[PDB]
Amino acid sequence: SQVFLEERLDGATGSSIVVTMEGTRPILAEVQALVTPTMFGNAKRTTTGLDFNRASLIMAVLEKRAGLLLQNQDAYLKSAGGVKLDEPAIDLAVAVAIASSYKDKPTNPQECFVGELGLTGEIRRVNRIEQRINEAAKLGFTKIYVPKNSLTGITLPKEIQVIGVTTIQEVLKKVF
Amino acid sequence: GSQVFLEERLDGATGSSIVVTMEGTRPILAEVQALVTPTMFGNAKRTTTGLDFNRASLIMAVLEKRAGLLLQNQDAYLKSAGGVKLDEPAIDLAVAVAIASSYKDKPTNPQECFVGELGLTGEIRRVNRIEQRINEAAKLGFTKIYVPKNSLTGITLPKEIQVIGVTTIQEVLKKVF
Amino acid sequence: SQVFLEERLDGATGSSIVVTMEGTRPILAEVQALVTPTMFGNAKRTTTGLDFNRASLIMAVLEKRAGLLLQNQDAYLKSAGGVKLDEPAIDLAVAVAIASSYKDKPTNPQECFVGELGLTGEIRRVNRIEQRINEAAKLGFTKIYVPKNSLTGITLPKEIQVIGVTTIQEVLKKVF
């Protein structure tokens, strides 16, 4: 947790932490977004470290289901440190980072997000959810948002608050 | 198996459908998702993940020319849930139903799944290993599966699941919606 | 033949059968086309299972040499079943399928087409023409169109009518 909190400027917006996997190892990674209005041509969508199309899908869901008006906004996204983010579980952190920059409201650098985001705005389960809460807890994170359907039949550790969520709107209201 | 899709399906959520696709020789159940919304400015946007961009374009042209859905002025975002790569003719029907579901604002039944190639004249053409697909659907608790009508000839159906043979995309939309 | 005739809706237009090769084995494949007028931007040309550029060439030849006005038409092409069509011999079937959709006139599902199409509208010879007429005959096709220059020095089987052609216009007049 500490290496992310030292790198987070005070009240810096447009970033979020994800618990992702390299092989079978769980890794913490920071997702960053910068949204500003488009001037000419198509709205700019430039990414590094995460798929361009995945970001487009996430921005369409955020507009249609959470009302953020992103169609006329340029978006620049990146994963800190050059970590390749290529799995469904990173959707939520990417969505939160975008909303954070759009809302100009920061996230807490001791919290992290795990979940696939469907086109109906739902937060879908992901694999190896137990290592994710464990790695997030073990490295000193206080709160982790996960798909609530991933919580069924699981033993929560008390070191970290585990917030089960089901929709992107529900997440935005808790976080912002 | 089947309710893991019913537990992930929000109540009355539109624009999704289940396909029985194949990875090697193993049959896999996968959810196709679509988001069709009117274009505001510029050209209509078409973004996909997990399935071929051109295949979706072809399917949308068929749905317009043969099922009357006016998709040329609508943006379309499509994805396969869970990062499953959908790369075979058999997924055409599920993609088409997912698109029609989002366009019609009417949901599909999360205990039903769709299998079939879609031709440019709107016909549902046969696919390989239809038996494993119907079996996998029954195995995992699905109640109904739509399959190519010509795939049924000389085949043994499981008792657990209704198998509806279809021949045209319009016939599917009217039974489903 | 029968597996193609059962899949062909009654009077369904914009499709045709080709006798192509997988390695040294001759295979029957159905080519499909859908032509409708273009609205904005460039005329749409979307393909799967066959090369985009090959279709563009075929559509330019059909306009310049057979008068079909395709420059203001969108075209969607595909090979049924996901079969990759990647050889000169498929030109004729692709051209006929396009003309069938453009003319709104169907082809006979018991007939098939074999030939390379040149830029002057000519039907050029192809390799292993004998297996192609044989495989077409053996699987119950009644008629096959082939390059007439491929017929020189060959023994025709009586099970199938073999129509030697030399130009795309001559083919369109026989078929439509």
Add this chain to the structure above:
Amino acid sequence: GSQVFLEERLDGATGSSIVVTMEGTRPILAEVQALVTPTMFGNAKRTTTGLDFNRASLIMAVLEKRAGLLLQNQDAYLKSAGGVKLDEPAIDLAVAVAIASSYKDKPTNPQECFVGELGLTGEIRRVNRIEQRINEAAKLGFTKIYVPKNSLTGITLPKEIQVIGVTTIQEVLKKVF
């Protein structure tokens, strides 16, 4: 060999030419085809198969700047007959002649073939293995072959075929058309 091209060549068919190209160490005869027609709407279309798109663009700029053919407002479709992949400098001359033939509406002689790289100042530059190319052309019954004039120095010509050494693209167009 040579008449297999003359038998496939419609009477007075324009926009084609023969090249002696190389696959590994074997020389192959191939027909280059061009279709040049005026643009109706939008930007001029350039579609190719069997030869590099950029190489055709370069050749068309040379033909315009050095041979006066106005190609900027013309669509061009090019292909190599038989699916032969043309990927070497020696094919430039045949491609240029095929383009000029379609533009001028004047045919080439199907018993003639062209070998040479085309420079941006319109010069015909030497190519490798000129002897196998001229020999293969004679072997297969061709009557005339145009080759780079500098490729002839110190070389033994076959008696069966006229070998015309050329130096500029304009010189070729005037001898050929």
Add this chain to the structure above:
Amino acid sequence: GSQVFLEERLDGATGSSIVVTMEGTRPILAEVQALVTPTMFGNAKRTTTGLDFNRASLIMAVLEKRAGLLLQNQDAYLKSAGGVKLDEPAIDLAVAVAIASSYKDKPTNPQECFVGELGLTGEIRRVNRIEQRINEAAKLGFTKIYVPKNSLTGITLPKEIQVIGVTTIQEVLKKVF
């Protein structure tokens, strides 16, 4: 090492900066060059060689949103000198300084080098193997190196070189320009 850059640097030449990057485990010194000039017609041009096109776009958006440089109406051409491929987060700071130098028409000191990843909120984030980078800079006679301020914790500095830990891109521009 250091003067080979000072000997190649024209007097008062703007738009260049030195980075300590890594090839495998070996640290390499490389010069990043930028050419920022106002757009005359059409959309702003962005051409790069030796470094990722998207990385430069991201860096230019950060410099505009966080350092006030108006780059949306400026063409940008970027390259790494010597054909060195720059493909790691640590080069962000040098690229940003090179861009700001060309935009501000103010040169950098060719005996200084820059190391750091640049975040979208303008922060300078830590990089790997900071010790070899600072050591290689000293080894080759550089007088000053800017590094991520958080990379210094628990590290032994060489006496030969000033090590300036920085935290924001604005702080760097004001110290450097």
Add this chain to the structure above:
Amino acid sequence: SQVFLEERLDGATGSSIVVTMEGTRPILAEVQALVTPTMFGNAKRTTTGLDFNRASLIMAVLEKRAGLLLQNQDAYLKSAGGVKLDEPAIDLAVAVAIASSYKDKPTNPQECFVGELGLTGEIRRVNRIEQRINEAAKLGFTKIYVPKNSLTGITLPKEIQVIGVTTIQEVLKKVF
């Protein structure tokens, strides 16, 4: 030298010779350029045998630092004979060939150019400069332009005039 001089038409403009490397062997290659005004859309930049982006950079430097107005000019570039030119040292020859076509003034086919060109118009050193002057001399070239900073500590052969240069403007004035 002789094989390049025989292929050079009298007063033919827009070409130049470079001493490049295939592995560790030094090779002579001819770079060609053709610049004409752009009509519609973006100015045409078509290349073969050398990188498209490298040519764009070189044309931007030639405009900003030597005043040649190339932004409204189409450019076609190629290496003679299909030789792949993929190293910093070819910059100078490419720049000279473009300027030659733009200025409508030829280069001498017995001269060659070696050097990387920086964004400030400077001619930067290249590796194995000694083989380059040697191969240029051995094959009968009379003059070679090289980066002057490459000359420090080197023994010049008298068979060939070696012109050390530092800027693209200085080169253009000597050559044109």
